[PDB]
Amino acid sequence: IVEGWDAEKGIAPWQVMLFRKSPQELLCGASLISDRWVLTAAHCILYPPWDKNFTENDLLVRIGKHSRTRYERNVEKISMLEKIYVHPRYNWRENLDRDIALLKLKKPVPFSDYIHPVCLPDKQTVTSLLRAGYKGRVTGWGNLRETWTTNINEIQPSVLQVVNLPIVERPVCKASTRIRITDNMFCAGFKVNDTKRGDACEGDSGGPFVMKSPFNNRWYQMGIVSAGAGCDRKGKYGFYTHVFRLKRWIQKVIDQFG
Amino acid sequence: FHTFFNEKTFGLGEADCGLRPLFEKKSLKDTTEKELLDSYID
Numbered sequence: 189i190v191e192g193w194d195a196e197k198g199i200a201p202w203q204v205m206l207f208r209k210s211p212q213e214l215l216c217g218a219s220l221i222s223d224r225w226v227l228t229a230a231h232c233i234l235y236p237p238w239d240k241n242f243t244e245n246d247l248l249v250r251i252g253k254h255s256r257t258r259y260e261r262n263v264e265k266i267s268m269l270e271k272i273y274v275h276p277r278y279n280w281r282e283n284l285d286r287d288i289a290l291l292k293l294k295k296p297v298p299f300s301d302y303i304h305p306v307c308l309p310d311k312q313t314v315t316s317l318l319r320a321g322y323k324g325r326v327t328g329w330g331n332l333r334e335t336w337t338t339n340i341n342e343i344q345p346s347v348l349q350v351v352n353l354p355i356v357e358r359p360v361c362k363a364s365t366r367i368r369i370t371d372n373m374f375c376a377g378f379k380v381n382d383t384k385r386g387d388a389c390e391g392d393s394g395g396p397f398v399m400k401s402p403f404n405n406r407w408y409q410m411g412i413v414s415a416g417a418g419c420d421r422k423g424k425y426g427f428y429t430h431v432f433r434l435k436r437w438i439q440k441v442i443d444q445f446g
Numbered sequence: 447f448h449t450f451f452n453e454k455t456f457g458l459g460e461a462d463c464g465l466r467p468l469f470e471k472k473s474l475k476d477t478t479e480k481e482l483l484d485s486y487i488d
């Protein structure tokens with residue numbers, strides 16, 4: 189996360205760390221939508237070009253974390269995966285369309301002051317909040333800046349980062365990139381100027397883009413970080429998987445259990 | 447809050463989702479919620 193700030197303890201209790209078993213390494217971000225289900229991006233699980241083709245056993249998730257490295261005893265929980273469901277229409281060879289995946293935990297994770305699910309949107313929430321100019325929040329453990337511009341230990345945050353970003357006008361972002369932005373995604377970011385522009389980076393992929401409802405006081409995940417324009421990636425705006433548009437698929441998978 | 451899933455398959459948590467224990471539950475507001483709510487202008 190670029191141009192963001194340190195997260196207050198429990199600010200994003202639904203933030204999840206998608207970890208690799210061996211070698212042990214933070215892989216992506218993700219979010220808790222219930223005590224047994226987790227949302228993250230498909231390209232985080234499957235993307236051959238960056239040699240990524242994981243399975244249930246290859247990785248695990250850490251919940252309730254704050255520190256990027258230090259083990260936070262009596263706060264974080266580790267969980268094995270029971271199954272991974274990446275959208276059947278996700279095609280890593282074309283673009284990021286439908287860049288989404290559901291992860292089922294082997295054991296329900298107990299809730300605490302630092303572990304709590306975020307809400308999934310409804311049509312009502314989308315029409316009132318998902319509009320250009322409205323700001324949303326992104327959290328993660330991705331790099332703080334472009335690689336090679338200083339020692340690595342200085343670009344990898346010690347604590348969870350947060351940054352607020354404005355939803356961008358669809359026509360405006362379609363014109364900023366040669367990449368296709370389908371109706372299953374939306375863009376967010378500051379205008380081409382605003383000097384120190386906040387954004388999400390590769391290590392933030394899979395993380396949640398949340399918004400707080402001024403109507404019922406709850407936090408809703410409107411998007412999943414698919415392609416942030418921060419750090420090393422070319423581009424002006426970040427791409428997010430439009431969570432609502434994929435709600436039916438989420439339900440189908442969960443109803444049947446994949 | 448109108449529920450959407452079944453807890454036998456979805457697991458626990460939906461009814462009370464989105465309400466942070468250290469914030470909404472304690473009537474405490476985080477450092478920047480303001481920026482967000484201030485942008486949801488009609």
Ligand SMILES: *[C@@H]1O[C@H](CO)[C@@H](O)[C@H](O)[C@H]1NC(C)=O
Pocket residue numbers: 236241
């Ligand atoms: C992922 O690896 C599996 C297991 O070796 C293999 O069968 C499959 O072809 C790989 N996935 C892709 C699309 O490359």
